[PDB]
Subunit: 266 residues, 3 copies
């Protein structure tokens, strides 16, 4: 759908309309828009004013980028993210990530809301994402499917090192600082397309496959991000324990904000 030039035009629009130069892009998942409250010097672009940006036909959720500083670090936030279940093809779901790269961003933080599959997780837990399982990807729904563009990356990029080891260590180490009751969980995120929720038998499948949390987003963006060389890390907020038998948001937002200090300099 999009050409290299389309991404570049969008990026140049943004660059000539703000003096902000973000090092870090952050995608806010459901219930996590509150992260934009922590930016200083906020400049806002509604998705509808940005050339080439996907928008929803559905009213209500407008969708926006907000540029600012988070804990002293220059960043851009996506408030309102695109999902496969809404009907967007994956190249639109992940369009913004390639834009961020052309903006100069070297780090992508991904957040989402997910169903706990690991019995020891509780509602309100934060799961540091260690790895993923791309079920749509197995069957053909991969955002890199089609001709490859070497201005972005390789034809066959590796994903085994997708979730940055350094950020993982610094996150485990930092979370201990925050005097929290429960430890920071860690585990594997599985994407399913949705939009209907999982049956019990489906949840047992996902658990047997080794998944600790399930949701309907994030993975396509991680893949495109890694294709073009961005450092990636992220977190799932566990908003339910899925059924296997027949304030927490504000905490994650504050943790993400503290972690900016740990992102390496450009």
């Amino acid at each position: 759908g999009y050409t290299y030039e389309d991404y570049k035009n969008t990026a140049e629009y943004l660059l000539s309309h703000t003096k902000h130069r973000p090092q870090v892009a952050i995608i806010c998942g459901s219930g996590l828009g509150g992260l934009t409250d922590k930016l200083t010097q906020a400049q806002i672009f509604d998705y509808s004013e940005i050339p080439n940006f996907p928008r929803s036909t559905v009213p209500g959720h407008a969708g926006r980028l907000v540029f600012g500083f988070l804990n002293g670090r220059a960043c851009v936030m996506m408030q309102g993210r695109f999902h496969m279940y809404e009907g967007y093809p994956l190249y639109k779901v992940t369009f913004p990530v390639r834009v961020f790269h052309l903006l100069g961003v070297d780090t992508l933080v991904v957040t989402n809301a997910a169903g706990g599959l690991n019995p020891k997780f509780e509602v309100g837990d934060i799961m540091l994402i260690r790895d993923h399982i791309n079920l749509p990807g197995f069957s053909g729904q991969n955002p890199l499917r089609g001709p490859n563009d070497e201005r972005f990356g390789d034809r066959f990029p590796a994903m085994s090192d997708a979730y940055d080891r350094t950020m993982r260590q610094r996150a485990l180490s930092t979370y201990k600082q925050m005097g929290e009751q429960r430890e920071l969980q860690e585990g594997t995120y599985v994407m399913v397309a949705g939009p209907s929720f999982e049956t019990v038998a489906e949840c047992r499948v996902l658990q047997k496959l080794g998944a600790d949390a399930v949701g309907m987003s994030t993975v396509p963006e991680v893949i495109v991000a890694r294709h073009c060389g961005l450092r990636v890390f992220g977190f799932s907020l566990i908003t339910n324990k899925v059924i296997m038998d027949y304030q927490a948001a504000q905490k994650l937002e504050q943790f993400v904000s503290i972690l900016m200090a740990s992102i390496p300099l450009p």
Copy 2:
């Protein structure tokens, strides 16, 4: 994604409502080899799919397929004789189009039937499996009939499916079958949908078994999802027509009758 507007459904509902006097409470979708169930209908009135607005039909004549209104065991109902499959090339919003029409007709209950291959070793050809749950493999990957913008006149953006197969109807079906008298028990288990149309390899069948599927086929799950999305009560059955190979080494009429009997045990609107 969805190529139908709300109006399209409504027009198809209006057309039908104005061309029959029947007012079904229950819809029934007849799977392979179960078209005979329309024989048991009293005061039948037939609509060929081809004469119904917006309805899918084959590009291949030889089959038109048909909708039949009537009373089954005294219960007002409508029956799909001939269902659609993903493997024929239909998108899932066409496969499941009838279900939203039924909802607009005033139906509040959907009964689904199919022919499935048995994966549970203790099943036998001719068994009836009461559908307890499903595993939607196409849905995992993106092929879910709710994909696209959600229309709140039908349902929520994110409907639960964990309670999809009505528990009350399950209990009554188990109770009822026991009092009819047959050699073999009413089976119960998880249906797994795969797209087909090719049949499964031994390695694939083993995968399906390890995942906890009891029976496998190529239909039904989409219709159930859409039914639950617009709030219909759902239950259904698989007829085990073969036992799938896991190593490199009359039953229809019985189901038709059992369904007929069970109309009595369906709650009122």
Copy 3:
């Protein structure tokens, strides 16, 4: 399916009227296996670009030539390079050649690929005789037989449980043992994933748990279409890497297979 029956026939007629070669056997050469065309005698080459209705190999290393000739005296035709879903091709394109071959009068299809080893006992350089497959794209809808079935090619619901020919399997095992080699000929299940990005550790564990012995991004669609039209099928993966199954932190073989396929031409039964 965007192709009519006539599109297949026209492509076949074009070939039948531009070569006098009449192959019994088609062979699809995977990544790194194009050198198998070297062993043909009396070779006639068509570029895919000059063949009506034919798709293009966009992956470097997949040459994009249809080569007719004799291999160990057997009349065959070789796809030097193949097509993949990850390139952006729908499966009816990926598998277009298989039906052409059928109309050419071919009765045996040989599939080869480069694959990742999921079985711990495999090694880089091993050849795995394909015993069975797991079609993950197929579970979800991506099946080349999707759409109206044409009975001029085959049935609506063809079986795949006997896809990899038992006779050829036995003769392959038997023949390799005569061939004297350090490693024995491996045997196992091939799982197709779409790609193009490589698997995560957790994804490799999934594929192992499903019972797959090797993984790649091709072949299965071709086999399904071949079986649909009744062709005899067998095939091999060259294990080019052992996929990583654990988290780790600091804190010639092609020619062998090529030769072996050449030798096995003499075990293919005649028409």
